Symmetry: D2
Subunit: 219 residues, 4 copies
């Protein structure tokens, strides 16, 4: 397989949030079969970012998901040709983001080319006022729709003070070659900022993801 | 506790779907601490129902959820006084349902007083054409909001001929007395029609639900 | 026709908002061809209502719409058999209402059988805190879908101390007999409470509605 | 600085279902009559694989006839100008975001536009180019958090008949203090006047007029 136990990552994101332009570059590595990955991210343009960094972090690759043998792995099967994804993020206060990513593989290194755009965030809301602490862990529901893979996930940002701020993700994952399609299943996630400097010009980011069916038996 | 290991259930649902009125009564039982329950449901008015029975089934009580000791159990704590819930169901093709339930307890038996209303289902869609097979198992996200408990769940009906039909649930669960509130957590579900007669006048329904935190370890 | 220049109205609404049960009865009259109507409403059960009365008022009949001769009038054509409607009301803070009505005619009097249910209104929001002043006038977009008539309208409640609270309506209108279907068009509305008592146990309600095409010429 | 006749240039860069493109435009209009025309040319990404109509409302509320009794947020904002941000939520799950920065030099506006569309179904009307036009519309304008919001229920007329719905939410952001209007309406009619194969060249027109409801107030 072209997907090895250890792989490197490189990425570039260009984007806008409430009209503010930025560029972030990243480098990292992970373990595709263990479903883990870590990245170091640097703001190259647009510093200091005027919005909560957490809204970007899920845009920074389901290759890094532990898949059981009894669920076809849409993402690992897509290589060497790779895949792209498209996502909407609908926040409960009217903010909306779109993001797209093209994921290629060269040697032992994945390359992500990412575009991110966020509009209509209230100026005194938790995103523009940087009141978020983290995303909660989540469970994404994966299902085939019109020959490609969809994932929907109810996400929540934990806020300063302990409340939550909700966002609904819908992502379409699109292999560049025919791959064996999976039945309805779940991907559990936990994404975490491990460290950052004052204005998030430098961030270390981690994610762990594991695919499964329901653990509750039938009938 | 007032919540025993084995409990009975009765219910009455009155509702409408695309203007069609119906009444369903139920009797069943469950195991609150195992998170399991079974119900037998009878259509009393509105037969034969002209829509997919599956849309009703999640309206037919989070008391029946296995809660680990390290997550406060909002539902069991609420008794004897009990609790109510309110729910919206937003389907991907424009259909919307509202449902409400008042859950009371007398001796070993719960009563659910349920109202269900669905509007704007496309006439050739899978609900009005009875093309649903089941709900998939799910994971509901539970969190406190304005002093009460909210659950959001991405639901999916498996369709005849394959494919899924999506619905987003938002539920507010409202205890009738002060209880210890939980942190953010998950409830995994699997709801199943075990058996039915041809027009779904008689249905046997089962649900299993278990609460948890994420099993993925924290690295930060 | 059976629809005269002056008609009477009687109604009963049964409903729940945030679990609170109520019944309201109404009697009024209107001028179908002018598109105007007035009703007196009385809370019979559930007084004093603990939520903004404004959320109910649009559930208290498009027969009362002035239709120009060059737009088929879906509603007037449906009588004497009549029509039913179904509506969702999606508020910007998560509140959702469903409403249904069956509209019949006996002699000179319409009868409306209404069901109304509202869920998930935030306890400190403008509906549960009774901070609404009125609905703004509106323009509903009418179009055929699956052989019946659909209406979508962006609605807004003007609030105390300023600002607006948004709600999106989707209504399906279903004639009990076949009628000539209209092309895409608009219904302009203005709904107003003319008077009320302290707790809104008694309310006098008015609406004016007029159908049109766009007034802007093609090129 | 806003004259009876003004010119326009623009550049849009964007993506729809992952497909990148660039379009440039030049046109002119009459700010006080609320009319404008532009000629648009695809510079990158030809042939566009999606319905051109989804782009056309991104290609300036300066071109709106405002009556004297409604403050004109857009014309007041110059010379400094304004930006806007928009979401377009289609009924089949497609979502677009768009942003534009509008500047003025001499007699000529420049629009710098970004447009991104995601999650359009592959056999839907957008990816299958099944749209004929947008219907005329009425946008609801209201102040929110010191800037002007507009919400509009939009509909694409389809080949064969029927409509495909999209809801727009736009935030209009002046770069200086301006007199804020009360709640009001902007009526629109946007039309492609001509185009060549694959819409490499398009002539686009819009007419827009602001108003209050002319249904008279009855309440004291």
């Amino acid at each position: 397989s072209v997907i090895k136990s250890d792989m490197k990552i490189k990425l570039r994101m260009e984007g806008t949030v409430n009209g503010h332009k930025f560029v972030i570059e990243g480098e990292g590595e992970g373990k595709p079969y263990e479903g883990t990955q870590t990245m170091n991210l640097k703001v190259k343009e647009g510093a200091p970012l005027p919005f909560a960094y957490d809204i970007l972090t899920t845009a920074f690759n389901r290759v890094f998901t532990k898949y059981p043998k009894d669920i076809p792995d849409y993402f690992k099967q897509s290589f060497p040709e790779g895949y792209s994804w498209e996502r909407s993020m609908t926040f409960e206060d009217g903010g909306i983001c779109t993001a797209t990513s093209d994921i290629t593989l060269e040697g032992d290194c994945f390359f992500y080319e990412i575009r991110f755009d966020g509009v209509n965030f209230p100026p005194n809301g938790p995103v523009m006022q940087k009141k978020t602490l983290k995303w909660e862990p989540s469970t994404e529901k994966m299902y085939v729709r019109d020959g490609v893979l969809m994932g929907d996930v109810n996400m929540a940002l934990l806020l300063e003070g302990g409340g939550h701020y909700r966002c609904d993700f819908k992502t379409t994952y699109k292999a560049k070659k025919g791959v064996q399609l999976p039945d309805y299943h779940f991907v559990d996630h936990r994404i975490e900022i491990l460290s950052h400097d004052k204005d998030y010009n430098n961030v270390k980011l981690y994610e762990h993801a594991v695919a499964r069916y329901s653990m509750l038996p039938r009938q």
